[PDB]
Design a protein around this ligand. Structure first.
Ligand SMILES: Cc1cc2nc3c(=O)[nH]c(=O)nc-3n(C[C@H](O)[C@H](O)[C@H](O)COP(=O)(O)OP(=O)(O)OC[C@H]3O[C@@H](n4cnc5c(N)ncnc54)[C@H](O)[C@@H]3O)c2cc1C
Length: 422
């Protein structure tokens, strides 16, 4: 078939790589000067920062993304991270890190509970695998099981870092599917070259399979003929297609289909699009003169105003920073109501840094905020719709149409796989 992909984000490039290998003519149209969307590198003062993602795969070398890459014969080294750690107050009862802190391994989170509560968690670790909690938020479920506030702080940190959500905003069943994927695929990892390593590898496969990628080209319309995708208009030129893959998310895709959509015949689709809620966050990048995390995993920070966790990917790939420097990146969840208040949100994160990393030698390199049309995810984890649209031959991929239960790009990969199978 003749196929076109709108947008060179990770979803679009995964699609292009698989479709070209599958024997289809593929052209990708990307509006920006470079490919990769929110998953590529940004050269900044000698550092390889990113356009979004923290240079990390949620399931490292074992998950749906890593698997997709092997399936299309993309070549890129993904290293498995060391176990994630968690920063907690020195004494139970301390509300923050002011009086000092200690670090525990992620898997030892129950160690801070009473014996009674620890044993309850041990049994739930067994029972929940096949008897999955459902029908409430994670926070509500935890509270029904254990009263110790530690688990809520820990859950909020995990949910903030991994999903850019609060634990009272994610369905418990989604969290248990995510947990099942940890067992299936393993922990985090870091691609050599950062995000761009993966982007470059996919571009190589696309090129080797006769696909073409066009940057600096904005798609302005999806052509529909008799309820069927028929092509696109990009930079005022018509391109025919039997298949259109949109990497823009449903909302933006709907706008491109505006002339063909019916508020009557497509009422369910309009309603769906109107419910989509993106997630928001702020990333603080530090130019560190010494290690702050000290390993290749995540440091979760549950006892802060805003910061949920931090990583240090130069532990895995030193080429992402100048000699004698580390790149340490922090994430904080931003609630939709506070997007209008980004300045004060940032201030709070900056205060957190002093308590997380007291007396350490670093400078704030860049602060980047994400929300709305360039968000953390186009659809909040646990809420993704499918990849289909009212029109045959038109599919949506990307983090506005993630496979259920995949964290971040693992979800993006699952979604692309679903479309490909269809
Ligand atoms: C701060 C932050 C940190 C993150 N950290 C991680 C992480 O650590 N691990 C992880 O797995 N994920 C992480 N993510 C999520 C990850 O970055 C995204 O899920 C992923 O990059 C989204 O990919 P996508 O397929 O949706 O495409 P997108 O990145 O949304 O790309 C869409 C592309 O379409 C182009 N486009 C838009 N309109 C048009 C048009 N009309 N014509 C042509 N092109 C168009 C855009 O320029 C863009 O390149 C993070 C996200 C954020 C915001």
């Amino acid at each position: 078939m003749k196929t076109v992909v709108i947008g060179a984000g990770l979803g679009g490039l995964l699609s292009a790589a698989r479709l070209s290998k599958a024997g289809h003519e593929v052209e990708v149209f990307e509006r920006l000067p470079i490919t990769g969307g929110r998953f590529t590198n940004l050269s900044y003062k000698g550092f390889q920062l990113s356009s979004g993602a923290f240079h990390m795969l949620p399931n490292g070398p074992g998950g749906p993304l890593a698997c997709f890459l092997k399936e299309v014969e993309a070549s890129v080294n993904i290293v498995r991270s060391e176990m994630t750690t968690v920063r907690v107050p020195l004494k139970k009862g301390n509300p923050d890190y002011v009086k000092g802190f200690k670090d525990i391994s992620f898997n030892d989170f129950p160690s801070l509970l009473s014996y009674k509560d620890r044993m309850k968690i041990a049994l739930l670790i067994v029972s929940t695998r096949k008897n999955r909690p459902s029908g409430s938020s994670l926070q509500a479920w935890i509270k029904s099981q254990v009263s110790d506030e530690w688990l809520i702080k820990f859950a909020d940190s995990f949910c903030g870092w991994a999903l850019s959500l609060k634990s009272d905003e994610v369905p418990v069943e989604e969290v248990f599917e995510i947990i099942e994927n940890m067992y299936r695929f393993g922990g985090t990892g870091i691609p050599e070259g950062g995000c761009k390593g993966i982007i470059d590898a996919l571009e190589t496969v696309i090129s080797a399979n006769g696909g073409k990628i066009h940057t600096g080209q904005e798609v302005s319309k999806i052509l529909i003929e008799n309820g069927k995708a028929a092509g696109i208009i990009a930079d005022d030129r018509i391109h025919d297609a039997d298949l259109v893959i949109s990497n823009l998310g449903h909302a933006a895709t709907a706008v491109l289909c505006s002339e063909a959509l019916s508020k009557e015949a497509d009422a369910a689709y309009f309603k769906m699009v109107g419910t989509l809620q993106p997630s928001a966050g702020i990333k603080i990048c530090l130019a560190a003169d010494e290690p702050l995390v000290g390993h290749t995993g995540v440091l979760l920070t549950p006892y802060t105003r805003r910061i949920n966790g931090v990583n240090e990917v130069t532990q895995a790939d030193p080429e992402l920073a100048p000699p004698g420097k580390h790149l340490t990146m922090c994430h904080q969840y931003v609630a939709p109501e506070n997007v209008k208040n980004l300045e004060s949100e940032i201030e709070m994160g900056l205060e957190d840094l002093k308590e997380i990393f007291p007396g350490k030698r670093y400078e704030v390199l860049l602060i980047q905020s994400y929300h709305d049309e360039w968000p953390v995810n186009r659809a909040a984890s646990g809420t993704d719709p499918g990849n289909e649209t009212p029109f045959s031959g038109l599919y949506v991929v990307g983090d506005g149409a993630k496979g259920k239960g995949g964290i971040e790009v693992e979800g993006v990969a699952l979604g692309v796989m679903s479309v490909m199978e269809k």
